[PDB]
Amino acid sequence: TKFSIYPPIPGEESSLRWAGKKFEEIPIAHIKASHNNTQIQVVSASNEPLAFASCGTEGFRNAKKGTGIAAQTAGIAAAARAKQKGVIHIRVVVKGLGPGRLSAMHGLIMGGLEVISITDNTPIPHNGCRPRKARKL
Amino acid sequence: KTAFSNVGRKISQRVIHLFDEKGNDLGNMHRANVIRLMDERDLRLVQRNTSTEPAEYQLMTGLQILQERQRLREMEKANPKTGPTLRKELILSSNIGQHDLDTKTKQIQQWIKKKHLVQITIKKGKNVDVSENEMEEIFHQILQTMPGIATFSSRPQAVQGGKALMCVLRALSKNEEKAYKETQETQERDT
């Protein structure tokens, strides 16, 4: 067949398998790319925490956490703890427009993990709560 | 300013005096050999004492890294020891108007009440000839407003070949205060 960019809906039967596992079963890599930090947490299909890493947990301080090298370092630290539990294929769910939004995705690949999808779950309200006032800096 | 958090897998110094999680002294070992123990037992290294010339690092579990600082959050709360003194500066002019001298004299009263150090400097007024007789009479005029609260730390000096005078003020020390108090009572009550 051809190749579609839309994810295979669970209900309808498909033929796309990864290591004999359906798309639903693949573990999920929740990335929260903030402006001053980047936390990464890998979970299974049944929401079971397997690995957690962040720039702070890798020995970075203050303004070094909001860089692209600290997010990549955090991906290698989470892709090395989850590869010992039998994780190879993951579903990336990026949340945030921070510096370590794409650099953490590269770090997960530098740990032996293969990314099959890229999901964006950045919080966008349909007017809800009021942000802080604009600054003059 | 430091925190009891893991340093990570990047060590600056090649030789470290590693310490066991249980407090056993592993002994000095190569930097590469330190990371092997962080994976073999999945433990994080924290620098216990920077001051010592030989690098000292202790590897403990994440829960052990939380309990440590969780006690440093109480020791400082129970017995806080913050003694740094901020230093303030003022640059006046001999011909400074009284109104501006009363506003700047009230600013010094807030600094002396917060146990700050006030560096006061006086300069020759614009196109004004004056000696150090009336140029040094402003310190005595400022200190008089604070009789007991403030006292000289340093004394007027010719910082810049005599054109300018610099002095430092401080909040009166507890002991000194008591002495001032004691003296005040005798003058009026005994009479």
Side-chain angles (χ1 to χ4, degrees):
Chain A
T1 57
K2 217 171 186 175
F3 173 87
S4 63
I5 50 179
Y6 303 100
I9 50 186
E12 293 299 358
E13 295 295 1
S14 60
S15 61
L16 286 172
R17 262 63 177 178
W18 299 266
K21 275 186 173 185
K22 293 180 179 183
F23 182 79
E24 311 83 301
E25 314 175 35
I26 311 291
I28 317 173
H30 291 276
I31 302 172
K32 186 186 177 187
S34 303
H35 301 104
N36 306 319
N37 207 7
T38 295
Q39 312 187 24
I40 310 182
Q41 181 184 3
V42 180
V43 295
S44 58
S46 57
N47 191 51
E48 303 178 22
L50 302 179
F52 180 89
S54 84
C55 303
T57 61
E58 293 313 311
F60 287 86
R61 271 95 194 181
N62 307 323
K64 306 296 195 162
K65 299 187 299 179
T67 51
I69 297 300
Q72 175 175 19
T73 304
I76 295 173
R81 293 181 168 278
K83 199 179 181 188
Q84 298 170 26
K85 299 199 174 181
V87 177
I88 305 178
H89 301 94
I90 54 175
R91 290 175 294 176
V92 174
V93 185
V94 196
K95 169 184 294 181
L97 300 178
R101 174 184 171 91
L102 172 56
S103 302
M105 200 176 311
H106 286 122
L108 290 171
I109 299 176
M110 299 181 187
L113 301 185
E114 296 190 12
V115 176
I116 68 177
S117 64
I118 307 179
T119 309
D120 184 348
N121 186 9
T122 315
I124 304 177
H126 308 162
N127 276 24
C129 288
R130 182 177 168 145
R132 46 153 302 165
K133 67 194 187 78
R135 41 191 280 172
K136 314 177 182 83
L137 184 54
Chain B
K1 202 301 185 183
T2 51
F4 200 88
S5 296
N6 78 325
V7 196
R9 299 171 54 89
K10 199 170 196 59
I11 300 182
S12 58
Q13 314 177 20
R14 295 177 63 184
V15 176
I16 282 176
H17 191 33
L18 194 56
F19 268 67
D20 211 320
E21 55 171 353
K22 283 179 182 165
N24 293 0
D25 186 336
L26 299 185
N28 291 337
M29 63 183 66
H30 196 266
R31 185 177 55 186
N33 293 332
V34 170
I35 303 180
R36 300 169 57 198
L37 292 177
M38 301 176 68
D39 300 339
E40 282 171 16
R41 291 182 275 181
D42 177 10
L43 303 172
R44 307 190 183 269
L45 48 66
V46 294
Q47 67 189 10
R48 56 181 301 169
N49 275 337
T50 66
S51 58
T52 76
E53 322 173 4
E56 205 169 30
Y57 289 82
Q58 170 163 356
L59 65 84
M60 47 177 59
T61 56
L63 196 53
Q64 285 183 31
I65 298 185
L66 168 71
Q67 287 178 326
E68 191 56 23
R69 50 174 158 91
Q70 199 159 22
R71 100 185 185 201
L72 293 169
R73 178 87 156 115
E74 186 160 15
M75 291 185 69
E76 294 177 18
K77 272 187 180 184
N79 189 3
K81 295 192 181 185
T82 80
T85 72
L86 272 167
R87 188 184 190 92
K88 292 298 186 180
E89 299 171 28
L90 281 181
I91 311 173
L92 318 186
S93 302
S94 65
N95 59 352
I96 187 172
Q98 195 50 47
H99 179 71
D100 309 309
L101 193 68
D102 296 359
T103 300
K104 289 188 171 184
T105 294
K106 179 179 174 175
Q107 185 175 29
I108 300 176
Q109 300 173 0
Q110 304 302 339
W111 291 337
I112 291 301
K113 185 198 67 168
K114 296 190 162 188
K115 314 299 182 167
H116 294 166
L117 284 192
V118 186
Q119 183 174 354
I120 308 167
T121 306
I122 308 194
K123 292 189 171 174
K124 298 293 188 65
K126 199 175 179 179
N127 67 82
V128 162
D129 177 29
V130 75
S131 66
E132 70 166 357
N133 289 15
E134 284 177 18
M135 183 190 188
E136 179 196 325
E137 197 70 345
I138 302 185
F139 301 101
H140 297 95
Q141 176 192 3
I142 289 175
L143 202 43
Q144 218 158 45
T145 45
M146 289 150 293
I149 313 183
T151 51
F152 274 106
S153 295
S154 298
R155 301 203 67 99
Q157 306 164 324
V159 182
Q160 318 166 319
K163 60 197 181 179
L165 273 58
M166 189 207 73
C167 101
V168 178
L169 296 181
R170 63 171 181 176
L172 197 53
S173 46
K174 289 188 182 184
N175 291 336
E176 272 188 65
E177 188 190 2
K178 295 178 185 178
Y180 168 86
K181 291 191 190 194
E182 151 168 356
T183 53
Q184 172 190 1
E185 297 188 331
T186 75
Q187 297 199 29
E188 296 189 64
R189 302 179 188 184
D190 304 8
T191 45

PDB file of all heavy atoms in Angstrom, chain B residues 35-66:
ATOM      1  N   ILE B  35      31.675   6.773  37.093  1.00  0.00           N
ATOM      2  CA  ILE B  35      30.413   6.614  36.378  1.00  0.00           C
ATOM      3  C   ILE B  35      29.988   5.153  36.344  1.00  0.00           C
ATOM      4  O   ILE B  35      28.790   4.852  36.259  1.00  0.00           O
ATOM      5  CB  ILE B  35      30.528   7.198  34.957  1.00  0.00           C
ATOM      6  CG1 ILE B  35      30.943   8.673  35.030  1.00  0.00           C
ATOM      7  CG2 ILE B  35      29.207   7.036  34.211  1.00  0.00           C
ATOM      8  CD1 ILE B  35      31.093   9.356  33.680  1.00  0.00           C
ATOM      9  N   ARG B  36      30.940   4.221  36.410  1.00  0.00           N
ATOM     10  CA  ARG B  36      30.577   2.808  36.396  1.00  0.00           C
ATOM     11  C   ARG B  36      29.727   2.452  37.607  1.00  0.00           C
ATOM     12  O   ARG B  36      28.806   1.632  37.511  1.00  0.00           O
ATOM     13  CB  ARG B  36      31.831   1.938  36.355  1.00  0.00           C
ATOM     14  CG  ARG B  36      32.708   2.156  35.139  1.00  0.00           C
ATOM     15  CD  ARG B  36      34.046   1.464  35.317  1.00  0.00           C
ATOM     16  NE  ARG B  36      33.883   0.034  35.570  1.00  0.00           N
ATOM     17  CZ  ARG B  36      34.822  -0.749  36.092  1.00  0.00           C
ATOM     18  NH1 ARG B  36      36.005  -0.248  36.427  1.00  0.00           N
ATOM     19  NH2 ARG B  36      34.576  -2.037  36.285  1.00  0.00           N
ATOM     20  N   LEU B  37      30.019   3.060  38.756  1.00  0.00           N
ATOM     21  CA  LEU B  37      29.251   2.789  39.962  1.00  0.00           C
ATOM     22  C   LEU B  37      27.904   3.496  39.962  1.00  0.00           C
ATOM     23  O   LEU B  37      27.016   3.108  40.730  1.00  0.00           O
ATOM     24  CB  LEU B  37      30.052   3.209  41.196  1.00  0.00           C
ATOM     25  CG  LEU B  37      31.303   2.387  41.513  1.00  0.00           C
ATOM     26  CD1 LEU B  37      32.019   2.972  42.715  1.00  0.00           C
ATOM     27  CD2 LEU B  37      30.966   0.920  41.758  1.00  0.00           C
ATOM     28  N   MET B  38      27.729   4.516  39.121  1.00  0.00           N
ATOM     29  CA  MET B  38      26.442   5.193  39.036  1.00  0.00           C
ATOM     30  C   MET B  38      25.440   4.383  38.227  1.00  0.00           C
ATOM     31  O   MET B  38      24.229   4.507  38.442  1.00  0.00           O
ATOM     32  CB  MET B  38      26.614   6.578  38.414  1.00  0.00           C
ATOM     33  CG  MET B  38      27.552   7.491  39.182  1.00  0.00           C
ATOM     34  SD  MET B  38      27.810   9.072  38.357  1.00  0.00           S
ATOM     35  CE  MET B  38      26.184   9.807  38.515  1.00  0.00           C
ATOM     36  N   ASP B  39      25.922   3.554  37.303  1.00  0.00           N
ATOM     37  CA  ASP B  39      25.064   2.689  36.505  1.00  0.00           C
ATOM     38  C   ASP B  39      24.915   1.312  37.134  1.00  0.00           C
ATOM     39  O   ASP B  39      23.817   0.744  37.136  1.00  0.00           O
ATOM     40  CB  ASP B  39      25.625   2.553  35.089  1.00  0.00           C
ATOM     41  CG  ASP B  39      25.715   3.881  34.369  1.00  0.00           C
ATOM     42  OD1 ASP B  39      25.004   4.824  34.773  1.00  0.00           O
ATOM     43  OD2 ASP B  39      26.494   3.982  33.398  1.00  0.00           O
ATOM     44  N   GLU B  40      26.009   0.766  37.667  1.00  0.00           N
ATOM     45  CA  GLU B  40      25.964  -0.558  38.273  1.00  0.00           C
ATOM     46  C   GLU B  40      24.902  -0.630  39.363  1.00  0.00           C
ATOM     47  O   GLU B  40      24.237  -1.661  39.524  1.00  0.00           O
ATOM     48  CB  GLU B  40      27.338  -0.913  38.838  1.00  0.00           C
ATOM     49  CG  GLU B  40      28.336  -1.367  37.789  1.00  0.00           C
ATOM     50  CD  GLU B  40      29.739  -1.512  38.343  1.00  0.00           C
ATOM     51  OE1 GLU B  40      29.888  -1.564  39.583  1.00  0.00           O
ATOM     52  OE2 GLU B  40      30.695  -1.569  37.541  1.00  0.00           O
ATOM     53  N   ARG B  41      24.727   0.452  40.122  1.00  0.00           N
ATOM     54  CA  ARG B  41      23.758   0.486  41.210  1.00  0.00           C
ATOM     55  C   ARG B  41      22.698   1.565  41.025  1.00  0.00           C
ATOM     56  O   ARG B  41      21.865   1.756  41.920  1.00  0.00           O
ATOM     57  CB  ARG B  41      24.477   0.691  42.547  1.00  0.00           C
ATOM     58  CG  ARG B  41      25.319  -0.495  42.982  1.00  0.00           C
ATOM     59  CD  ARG B  41      25.974  -0.246  44.330  1.00  0.00           C
ATOM     60  NE  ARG B  41      27.230   0.489  44.205  1.00  0.00           N
ATOM     61  CZ  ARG B  41      28.007   0.820  45.231  1.00  0.00           C
ATOM     62  NH1 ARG B  41      27.664   0.483  46.467  1.00  0.00           N
ATOM     63  NH2 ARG B  41      29.132   1.489  45.022  1.00  0.00           N
ATOM     64  N   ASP B  42      22.688   2.257  39.887  1.00  0.00           N
ATOM     65  CA  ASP B  42      21.704   3.299  39.602  1.00  0.00           C
ATOM     66  C   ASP B  42      21.614   4.290  40.768  1.00  0.00           C
ATOM     67  O   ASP B  42      20.603   4.403  41.459  1.00  0.00           O
ATOM     68  CB  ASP B  42      20.339   2.670  39.303  1.00  0.00           C
ATOM     69  CG  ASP B  42      19.252   3.703  39.069  1.00  0.00           C
ATOM     70  OD1 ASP B  42      19.576   4.904  38.958  1.00  0.00           O
ATOM     71  OD2 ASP B  42      18.068   3.312  39.001  1.00  0.00           O
ATOM     72  N   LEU B  43      22.719   5.004  40.969  1.00  0.00           N
ATOM     73  CA  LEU B  43      22.839   5.966  42.054  1.00  0.00           C
ATOM     74  C   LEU B  43      23.410   7.275  41.522  1.00  0.00           C
ATOM     75  O   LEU B  43      24.083   7.311  40.488  1.00  0.00           O
ATOM     76  CB  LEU B  43      23.709   5.407  43.188  1.00  0.00           C
ATOM     77  CG  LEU B  43      23.198   4.075  43.753  1.00  0.00           C
ATOM     78  CD1 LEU B  43      24.186   3.459  44.721  1.00  0.00           C
ATOM     79  CD2 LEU B  43      21.851   4.251  44.429  1.00  0.00           C
ATOM     80  N   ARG B  44      23.134   8.354  42.251  1.00  0.00           N
ATOM     81  CA  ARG B  44      23.521   9.705  41.863  1.00  0.00           C
ATOM     82  C   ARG B  44      24.556  10.250  42.840  1.00  0.00           C
ATOM     83  O   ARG B  44      24.436  10.047  44.052  1.00  0.00           O
ATOM     84  CB  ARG B  44      22.299  10.622  41.832  1.00  0.00           C
ATOM     85  CG  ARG B  44      21.159  10.101  40.980  1.00  0.00           C
ATOM     86  CD  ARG B  44      20.093  11.158  40.795  1.00  0.00           C
ATOM     87  NE  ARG B  44      18.951  10.669  40.028  1.00  0.00           N
ATOM     88  CZ  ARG B  44      18.828  10.764  38.709  1.00  0.00           C
ATOM     89  NH1 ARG B  44      19.785  11.321  37.977  1.00  0.00           N
ATOM     90  NH2 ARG B  44      17.742  10.290  38.116  1.00  0.00           N
ATOM     91  N   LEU B  45      25.563  10.947  42.312  1.00  0.00           N
ATOM     92  CA  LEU B  45      26.650  11.494  43.117  1.00  0.00           C
ATOM     93  C   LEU B  45      26.402  12.961  43.449  1.00  0.00           C
ATOM     94  O   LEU B  45      25.997  13.745  42.585  1.00  0.00           O
ATOM     95  CB  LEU B  45      27.997  11.314  42.409  1.00  0.00           C
ATOM     96  CG  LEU B  45      28.199  11.679  40.931  1.00  0.00           C
ATOM     97  CD1 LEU B  45      28.073  13.164  40.630  1.00  0.00           C
ATOM     98  CD2 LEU B  45      29.552  11.169  40.465  1.00  0.00           C
ATOM     99  N   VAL B  46      26.594  13.309  44.720  1.00  0.00           N
ATOM    100  CA  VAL B  46      26.434  14.668  45.223  1.00  0.00           C
ATOM    101  C   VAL B  46      27.720  15.076  45.930  1.00  0.00           C
ATOM    102  O   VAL B  46      28.305  14.278  46.671  1.00  0.00           O
ATOM    103  CB  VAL B  46      25.229  14.781  46.174  1.00  0.00           C
ATOM    104  CG1 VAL B  46      23.941  14.533  45.424  1.00  0.00           C
ATOM    105  CG2 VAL B  46      25.360  13.794  47.320  1.00  0.00           C
ATOM    106  N   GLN B  47      28.162  16.311  45.697  1.00  0.00           N
ATOM    107  CA  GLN B  47      29.384  16.817  46.315  1.00  0.00           C
ATOM    108  C   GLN B  47      29.069  17.240  47.745  1.00  0.00           C
ATOM    109  O   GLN B  47      28.366  18.230  47.971  1.00  0.00           O
ATOM    110  CB  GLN B  47      29.959  17.969  45.494  1.00  0.00           C
ATOM    111  CG  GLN B  47      29.116  19.232  45.474  1.00  0.00           C
ATOM    112  CD  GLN B  47      29.631  20.257  44.482  1.00  0.00           C
ATOM    113  OE1 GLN B  47      30.504  19.965  43.665  1.00  0.00           O
ATOM    114  NE2 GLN B  47      29.086  21.466  44.544  1.00  0.00           N
ATOM    115  N   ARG B  48      29.568  16.473  48.716  1.00  0.00           N
ATOM    116  CA  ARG B  48      29.291  16.787  50.114  1.00  0.00           C
ATOM    117  C   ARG B  48      30.082  18.000  50.591  1.00  0.00           C
ATOM    118  O   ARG B  48      29.520  18.895  51.233  1.00  0.00           O
ATOM    119  CB  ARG B  48      29.580  15.570  50.993  1.00  0.00           C
ATOM    120  CG  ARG B  48      30.986  15.008  50.876  1.00  0.00           C
ATOM    121  CD  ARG B  48      31.155  13.790  51.770  1.00  0.00           C
ATOM    122  NE  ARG B  48      30.905  14.098  53.175  1.00  0.00           N
ATOM    123  CZ  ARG B  48      30.780  13.181  54.130  1.00  0.00           C
ATOM    124  NH1 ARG B  48      30.881  11.891  53.837  1.00  0.00           N
ATOM    125  NH2 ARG B  48      30.552  13.553  55.382  1.00  0.00           N
ATOM    126  N   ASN B  49      31.381  18.054  50.295  1.00  0.00           N
ATOM    127  CA  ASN B  49      32.247  19.130  50.770  1.00  0.00           C
ATOM    128  C   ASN B  49      33.113  19.642  49.627  1.00  0.00           C
ATOM    129  O   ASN B  49      34.013  18.936  49.159  1.00  0.00           O
ATOM    130  CB  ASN B  49      33.120  18.651  51.931  1.00  0.00           C
ATOM    131  CG  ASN B  49      32.419  18.756  53.271  1.00  0.00           C
ATOM    132  OD1 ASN B  49      31.486  19.543  53.440  1.00  0.00           O
ATOM    133  ND2 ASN B  49      32.867  17.961  54.234  1.00  0.00           N
ATOM    134  N   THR B  50      32.838  20.869  49.182  1.00  0.00           N
ATOM    135  CA  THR B  50      33.681  21.510  48.177  1.00  0.00           C
ATOM    136  C   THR B  50      34.995  21.995  48.779  1.00  0.00           C
ATOM    137  O   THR B  50      36.036  21.977  48.112  1.00  0.00           O
ATOM    138  CB  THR B  50      32.939  22.681  47.531  1.00  0.00           C
ATOM    139  OG1 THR B  50      32.715  23.706  48.508  1.00  0.00           O
ATOM    140  CG2 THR B  50      31.600  22.228  46.964  1.00  0.00           C
ATOM    141  N   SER B  51      34.961  22.434  50.041  1.00  0.00           N
ATOM    142  CA  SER B  51      36.107  23.124  50.631  1.00  0.00           C
ATOM    143  C   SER B  51      37.371  22.274  50.595  1.00  0.00           C
ATOM    144  O   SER B  51      38.466  22.794  50.348  1.00  0.00           O
ATOM    145  CB  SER B  51      35.780  23.525  52.069  1.00  0.00           C
ATOM    146  OG  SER B  51      35.439  22.390  52.848  1.00  0.00           O
ATOM    147  N   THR B  52      37.251  20.974  50.844  1.00  0.00           N
ATOM    148  CA  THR B  52      38.435  20.127  50.892  1.00  0.00           C
ATOM    149  C   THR B  52      39.157  20.145  49.549  1.00  0.00           C
ATOM    150  O   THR B  52      38.529  20.116  48.488  1.00  0.00           O
ATOM    151  CB  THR B  52      38.065  18.687  51.263  1.00  0.00           C
ATOM    152  OG1 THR B  52      37.482  18.030  50.130  1.00  0.00           O
ATOM    153  CG2 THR B  52      37.099  18.644  52.445  1.00  0.00           C
ATOM    154  N   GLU B  53      40.487  20.199  49.602  1.00  0.00           N
ATOM    155  CA  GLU B  53      41.259  20.230  48.363  1.00  0.00           C
ATOM    156  C   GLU B  53      41.052  18.966  47.541  1.00  0.00           C
ATOM    157  O   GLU B  53      40.843  19.084  46.321  1.00  0.00           O
ATOM    158  CB  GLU B  53      42.751  20.450  48.655  1.00  0.00           C
ATOM    159  CG  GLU B  53      43.067  21.419  49.792  1.00  0.00           C
ATOM    160  CD  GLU B  53      44.544  21.444  50.134  1.00  0.00           C
ATOM    161  OE1 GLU B  53      45.330  20.775  49.432  1.00  0.00           O
ATOM    162  OE2 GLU B  53      44.918  22.133  51.107  1.00  0.00           O
ATOM    163  N   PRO B  54      41.090  17.761  48.112  1.00  0.00           N
ATOM    164  CA  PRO B  54      40.729  16.575  47.327  1.00  0.00           C
ATOM    165  C   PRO B  54      39.224  16.545  47.115  1.00  0.00           C
ATOM    166  O   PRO B  54      38.450  16.758  48.050  1.00  0.00           O
ATOM    167  CB  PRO B  54      41.204  15.401  48.196  1.00  0.00           C
ATOM    168  CG  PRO B  54      41.971  16.007  49.339  1.00  0.00           C
ATOM    169  CD  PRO B  54      41.482  17.407  49.484  1.00  0.00           C
ATOM    170  N   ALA B  55      38.811  16.283  45.879  1.00  0.00           N
ATOM    171  CA  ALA B  55      37.389  16.280  45.580  1.00  0.00           C
ATOM    172  C   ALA B  55      36.688  15.198  46.387  1.00  0.00           C
ATOM    173  O   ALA B  55      37.145  14.053  46.453  1.00  0.00           O
ATOM    174  CB  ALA B  55      37.162  16.054  44.087  1.00  0.00           C
ATOM    175  N   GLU B  56      35.571  15.566  47.005  1.00  0.00           N
ATOM    176  CA  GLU B  56      34.779  14.648  47.809  1.00  0.00           C
ATOM    177  C   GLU B  56      33.371  14.573  47.241  1.00  0.00           C
ATOM    178  O   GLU B  56      32.686  15.595  47.124  1.00  0.00           O
ATOM    179  CB  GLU B  56      34.736  15.092  49.274  1.00  0.00           C
ATOM    180  CG  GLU B  56      34.487  13.954  50.245  1.00  0.00           C
ATOM    181  CD  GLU B  56      34.712  14.357  51.688  1.00  0.00           C
ATOM    182  OE1 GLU B  56      34.503  15.543  52.016  1.00  0.00           O
ATOM    183  OE2 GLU B  56      35.095  13.485  52.497  1.00  0.00           O
ATOM    184  N   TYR B  57      32.945  13.362  46.895  1.00  0.00           N
ATOM    185  CA  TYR B  57      31.620  13.117  46.350  1.00  0.00           C
ATOM    186  C   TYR B  57      31.045  11.867  46.991  1.00  0.00           C
ATOM    187  O   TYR B  57      31.752  10.871  47.167  1.00  0.00           O
ATOM    188  CB  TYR B  57      31.666  12.948  44.829  1.00  0.00           C
ATOM    189  CG  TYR B  57      31.957  14.219  44.061  1.00  0.00           C
ATOM    190  CD1 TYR B  57      33.255  14.677  43.901  1.00  0.00           C
ATOM    191  CD2 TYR B  57      30.933  14.942  43.468  1.00  0.00           C
ATOM    192  CE1 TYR B  57      33.523  15.830  43.188  1.00  0.00           C
ATOM    193  CE2 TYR B  57      31.193  16.092  42.753  1.00  0.00           C
ATOM    194  CZ  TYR B  57      32.488  16.533  42.616  1.00  0.00           C
ATOM    195  OH  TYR B  57      32.749  17.682  41.905  1.00  0.00           O
ATOM    196  N   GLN B  58      29.762  11.922  47.336  1.00  0.00           N
ATOM    197  CA  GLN B  58      29.055  10.788  47.911  1.00  0.00           C
ATOM    198  C   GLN B  58      27.890  10.430  47.004  1.00  0.00           C
ATOM    199  O   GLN B  58      27.118  11.308  46.604  1.00  0.00           O
ATOM    200  CB  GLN B  58      28.553  11.099  49.322  1.00  0.00           C
ATOM    201  CG  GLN B  58      27.608  10.053  49.879  1.00  0.00           C
ATOM    202  CD  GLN B  58      27.456  10.150  51.383  1.00  0.00           C
ATOM    203  OE1 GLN B  58      28.119  10.957  52.033  1.00  0.00           O
ATOM    204  NE2 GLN B  58      26.585   9.321  51.944  1.00  0.00           N
ATOM    205  N   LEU B  59      27.769   9.149  46.676  1.00  0.00           N
ATOM    206  CA  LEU B  59      26.703   8.656  45.815  1.00  0.00           C
ATOM    207  C   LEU B  59      25.591   8.083  46.683  1.00  0.00           C
ATOM    208  O   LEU B  59      25.848   7.251  47.559  1.00  0.00           O
ATOM    209  CB  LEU B  59      27.251   7.630  44.821  1.00  0.00           C
ATOM    210  CG  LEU B  59      27.812   6.288  45.297  1.00  0.00           C
ATOM    211  CD1 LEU B  59      26.729   5.248  45.514  1.00  0.00           C
ATOM    212  CD2 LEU B  59      28.837   5.785  44.293  1.00  0.00           C
ATOM    213  N   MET B  60      24.369   8.567  46.470  1.00  0.00           N
ATOM    214  CA  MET B  60      23.214   8.140  47.242  1.00  0.00           C
ATOM    215  C   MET B  60      21.993   8.076  46.336  1.00  0.00           C
ATOM    216  O   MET B  60      21.993   8.599  45.219  1.00  0.00           O
ATOM    217  CB  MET B  60      22.931   9.084  48.416  1.00  0.00           C
ATOM    218  CG  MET B  60      22.946  10.557  48.040  1.00  0.00           C
ATOM    219  SD  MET B  60      22.530  11.663  49.404  1.00  0.00           S
ATOM    220  CE  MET B  60      23.791  11.254  50.602  1.00  0.00           C
ATOM    221  N   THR B  61      20.946   7.423  46.835  1.00  0.00           N
ATOM    222  CA  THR B  61      19.705   7.307  46.089  1.00  0.00           C
ATOM    223  C   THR B  61      18.977   8.647  46.047  1.00  0.00           C
ATOM    224  O   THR B  61      19.262   9.568  46.818  1.00  0.00           O
ATOM    225  CB  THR B  61      18.793   6.252  46.717  1.00  0.00           C
ATOM    226  OG1 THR B  61      18.563   6.569  48.096  1.00  0.00           O
ATOM    227  CG2 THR B  61      19.414   4.870  46.611  1.00  0.00           C
ATOM    228  N   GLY B  62      18.018   8.747  45.125  1.00  0.00           N
ATOM    229  CA  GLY B  62      17.261   9.981  44.993  1.00  0.00           C
ATOM    230  C   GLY B  62      16.509  10.342  46.259  1.00  0.00           C
ATOM    231  O   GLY B  62      16.415  11.515  46.624  1.00  0.00           O
ATOM    232  N   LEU B  63      15.958   9.338  46.944  1.00  0.00           N
ATOM    233  CA  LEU B  63      15.298   9.596  48.218  1.00  0.00           C
ATOM    234  C   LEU B  63      16.286  10.123  49.247  1.00  0.00           C
ATOM    235  O   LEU B  63      15.936  10.964  50.083  1.00  0.00           O
ATOM    236  CB  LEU B  63      14.627   8.320  48.724  1.00  0.00           C
ATOM    237  CG  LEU B  63      13.584   8.461  49.833  1.00  0.00           C
ATOM    238  CD1 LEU B  63      12.498   9.459  49.480  1.00  0.00           C
ATOM    239  CD2 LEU B  63      12.972   7.101  50.119  1.00  0.00           C
ATOM    240  N   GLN B  64      17.525   9.638  49.204  1.00  0.00           N
ATOM    241  CA  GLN B  64      18.538  10.109  50.138  1.00  0.00           C
ATOM    242  C   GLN B  64      18.947  11.544  49.834  1.00  0.00           C
ATOM    243  O   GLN B  64      19.379  12.269  50.738  1.00  0.00           O
ATOM    244  CB  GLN B  64      19.752   9.186  50.090  1.00  0.00           C
ATOM    245  CG  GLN B  64      19.543   7.850  50.776  1.00  0.00           C
ATOM    246  CD  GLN B  64      20.794   6.996  50.777  1.00  0.00           C
ATOM    247  OE1 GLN B  64      21.912   7.511  50.809  1.00  0.00           O
ATOM    248  NE2 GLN B  64      20.613   5.681  50.731  1.00  0.00           N
ATOM    249  N   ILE B  65      18.811  11.973  48.577  1.00  0.00           N
ATOM    250  CA  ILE B  65      19.150  13.343  48.214  1.00  0.00           C
ATOM    251  C   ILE B  65      18.039  14.304  48.606  1.00  0.00           C
ATOM    252  O   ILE B  65      18.286  15.507  48.746  1.00  0.00           O
ATOM    253  CB  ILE B  65      19.425  13.442  46.704  1.00  0.00           C
ATOM    254  CG1 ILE B  65      20.618  12.560  46.333  1.00  0.00           C
ATOM    255  CG2 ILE B  65      19.662  14.896  46.291  1.00  0.00           C
ATOM    256  CD1 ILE B  65      21.070  12.672  44.890  1.00  0.00           C
ATOM    257  N   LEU B  66      16.823  13.798  48.803  1.00  0.00           N
ATOM    258  CA  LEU B  66      15.720  14.648  49.228  1.00  0.00           C
ATOM    259  C   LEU B  66      15.719  14.831  50.738  1.00  0.00           C
ATOM    260  O   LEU B  66      15.468  15.934  51.233  1.00  0.00           O
ATOM    261  CB  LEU B  66      14.394  14.044  48.766  1.00  0.00           C
ATOM    262  CG  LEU B  66      13.121  14.651  49.353  1.00  0.00           C
ATOM    263  CD1 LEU B  66      12.886  16.032  48.780  1.00  0.00           C
ATOM    264  CD2 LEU B  66      11.945  13.738  49.096  1.00  0.00           C
TER     265      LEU B  66
END
